[model samples]
Target chain A: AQYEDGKQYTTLEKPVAGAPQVLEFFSFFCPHCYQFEEVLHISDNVKKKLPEGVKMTKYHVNFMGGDLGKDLTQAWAVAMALGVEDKVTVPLFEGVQKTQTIRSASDIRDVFINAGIKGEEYDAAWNSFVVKSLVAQQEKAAADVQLRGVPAMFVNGKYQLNPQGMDTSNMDVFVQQYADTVKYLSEK
Target chain B: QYEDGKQYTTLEKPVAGAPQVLEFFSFFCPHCYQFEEVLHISDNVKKKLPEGVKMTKYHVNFMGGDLGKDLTQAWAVAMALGVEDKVTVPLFEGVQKTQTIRSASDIRDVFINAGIKGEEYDAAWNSFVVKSLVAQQEKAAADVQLRGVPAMFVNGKYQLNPQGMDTSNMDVFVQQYADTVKYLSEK
Candidate 1:
């Protein structure tokens, strides 16, 4: 639980070779994320343009959760366990974001079904190993980062907070920097 | 303002019998800039300040370490030795201009510019002031709290919220704040 060094990861399995991974250290309740919705889209665009082997993962921080933090945590748990990230992740993000109504695990399940995973298959995946691994992953990173803010972008192992958090006004700039940071990490 | 205005020779020795108000402020803080109106609108508010109530502004380089280095250092040391200002007009001016402080190093120079001793500046920094700044940050992070620039605690009893009243409502809010002070002063 106590992070000894700044560099820590939730899981031991590194990203599949060549596929640079994007992990968004985000909090669902962050006002800034609500204010900066447009910025996260650029992140989606970057996901689309990712060179072969680049993967995007979202690590939702439930630290300041409204108790629903753990519940939403389970929603992602369902996705990873089902191994349907490629099919449902984007739609899941959209459903959580676009509506003013509250987003819950059931909503995520419906979105997943709508995104292409059949109800039974998706429900089984939700109970599978992948989702459980991701939940543990998020719990681990939250402790290591000593995270305080939302949309806290981390590239590979480097934290891009000050310039990215303090100076930039637009989410696009943040995404561009995120891409650059990831590209640099990929090369390294 | 000095007709009945209280004065202090140094931050180290706030007049013993006089009521002292310490304002923690930074110039770059927008809220502080807006607070100018609140201070100016009511002479009664100014006059009714505890007869001996004096306000001293401590400029802090909280975000990214800008101006206020010397003021922060001098006051930090003075606070350590118990040498604080009891009367506040000058302190307000100094803190009001903190955002224009330009740079962190400039903050250090401004203290020397104010004639603080080199040794005192270094020593004072180790005491309560740094901890106070850290506490401010901790409180701010824990909640989206205390957004006003010019926040004050009078004799450690009165907590004056920021009313950076540049806009039209200065009179009402400042008086409301002054009324709080008046009520506290009586108690």
Candidate 2:
């Protein structure tokens, strides 16, 4: 269930922070992720009750649509490297899923502005060294994975949660199952 | 919450140190329909789990509206009896059968045929889970309104949608998910 060939720390030059990890694979235009919003907020409360040493990270996978081609994917790289991901990411998605609107780079920039991520951090982050490198890395990673779809998660690189048999309507149960799987993997 | 080290609400009968994961979704959602295929592709994705870790499913009626009401009821019943998979598959088929049946009783037969006992079905329809799901939907509409289907949660806090991971190949997600689950449970 562990991540294969793609999550290499050496390639990124950043060691995984360790402890438990959760990474969600999602798209801006997906409807499922939108459904997950409250679920996550509520679950965050539950995670705090954990014994200790558990963590999660959210990551964007940009192969869902080719509408903006790789620009959107590249944009995600910029967001990740720039540190304004949460501010701009979901809004960019809302703009598309709710309105059926196509977003340009400027529209994405607006999301950051709305999230209070403006000023120099915004400009530099958008065109920073990390973003440029991340964009190139994202494209290559997409090719390596050859994947499709969003709103997926990986737990400690041992268990993967995606669309199939998702039981999406009741995310709470799925979350528990993910924890169960992780507990299982960790024990082994 | 499912945010790794954030916070979480307790289970009714909490297991000491039990790993908990939460899944958020709405009824009558097609993206969720597509997501079903993604998890099915992987082996042990559903079956293999540790001793203490547990999973829960929340049927939030954000997009289904009144139509979601009928579907969410089905979820409540299914989870209450731990017969979710048995009834959910049939429920989807029934929902797609026609856009006509939106009442609790109308779809009752579908569950019966799916091997979900009538009593189990009724209790879920009337359970607390359904009540909370209805409430969550209203709140969702008031706060972040007008959206589509298929949303998810991990543990209790972390939330994700297409806006986060935009790949279509569910495995990429599943792979990451498997790892994330392990990380949270053991790390």
Candidate 3:
């Protein structure tokens, strides 16, 4: 198969810097993103397999453009600032996609509290200058990419991968292919 | 998203019969569980299915090893007893979410819980027909080189590209899948 074909992995018009940036653009409200995480097994497994110098990062897609979208985007910004993405990511997804626990920015803070965050710590991270800065940059990044949907990927800030497949049963293989593609791109 | 032949491959041989839909899944897979629980495929898709179309499910054994084998066997047994629709979904949720099903005995308990009694359950679980269906399922998985769960095959000829479906509206996804099956059935 022609893996690099434009439709499969669209190349960005103006590519950015090196170290092979593998960006996962996601939204907590998206079912496909939740399903992708389940299928990929774990974020840790994907991180463990990345070849040297390949950096994996996540950005919350605020494309929904309403109160819910802004709320989630702010919540993710706070989580990112506390450096608690690994702890909060899946729970956040489950809260929105499965349990219906998260509906607003306040609900998102409760999620953090439920996840063991101290009240002061939550307040500090939620209003930090760094959180504000990062959220703004992330919003711009989302617009720059013109992202079509959640759970989409950008490898090396050039080749983009949008979730595609019928048999998610082979999720292990799908994840492996994703890791392998990153390694291959890094080598080039 | 990638197009067909890139994301999903076509089957070498179309599956048998008209309007026959095959769903390949693993009870242990969370994605399959979510699809069953969240989407309500039967309520959303199957109940609204156009006349003359039938849906069948096959259990794949890629994840759980011996436990997976036992699950597939249990699935076949339920199908043999004509109790699949009643037993399969609940069992899938239990095994995936609660880790309650670890052995064949656990599966038997589930069948019993679903109202299948002693002799009937025993006969169905141990029947030659059940064994045959299990064998067929295994063979089909091997033949198709199945990579993932919740895979749909329309008339055994085309593999439905989940990427091709609209995830934003599941009703549209269900309608698209059903319409594809109906469209393929005519050809």
Index of the highest-TM-score prediction: 3
TM-score of chain A of 2: 0.65
Off by over 4 Å in 1: A1-21, A34-40, A48-54, A86-98, A161-174, B1-187
Model 3 clash tally?
Answer: 7
Model 2 C-alpha RMSD to native: 21.4
Cα RMSD for predicted model 1: 15.5
| lDDT for each residue of candidate 1 in A68-161, tens digit (9 for 90 to 100) | 4576676666766666555754554444434422345566567777877788887676676777787887877755555665655555544333
Say which prediction, candidate 1 or candidate 3, comes out ahead on TM-score: 3
Model 3 scores a TM of 0.52
lDDT of 3 by residue, A1-188 (tens): 23564534567787755423777777765555665565455345657777766667788875432455677787788888888887888788887657656545666788888889987898888688988888897777766677776667777767766334222335566667665555555455
Instruction: For model 2, state the Cα shift of residue A156 in Å.
Output: 4.1
lDDT tens digits, residue span B29-134, model 2: 6555434522431133334447576665556565556767667666666655677777665565445322324567767887888777788777767778867755
What is candidate 2's lDDT per residue for A1-188, written digit by digit as tens? 34222321112222233413545555664545555543344234334443367654555555434335355666677677766665665677666544434345566666667778765776787677787787666554433333355555545544444333333345566555445444443333
- TM-score list, all predictions: 0.40, 0.41, 0.52
Q: Native-contact recovery for every candidate?
A: 0.00, 0.00, 0.00
Best by DockQ: 3
Off by over 4 Å in 3: A1-188, B1-9, B12-19, B169-172
Q: lDDT winner among the candidates? A: 3
Error of 2 at A46 (Å): 8.7
TM-score of 1: 0.40
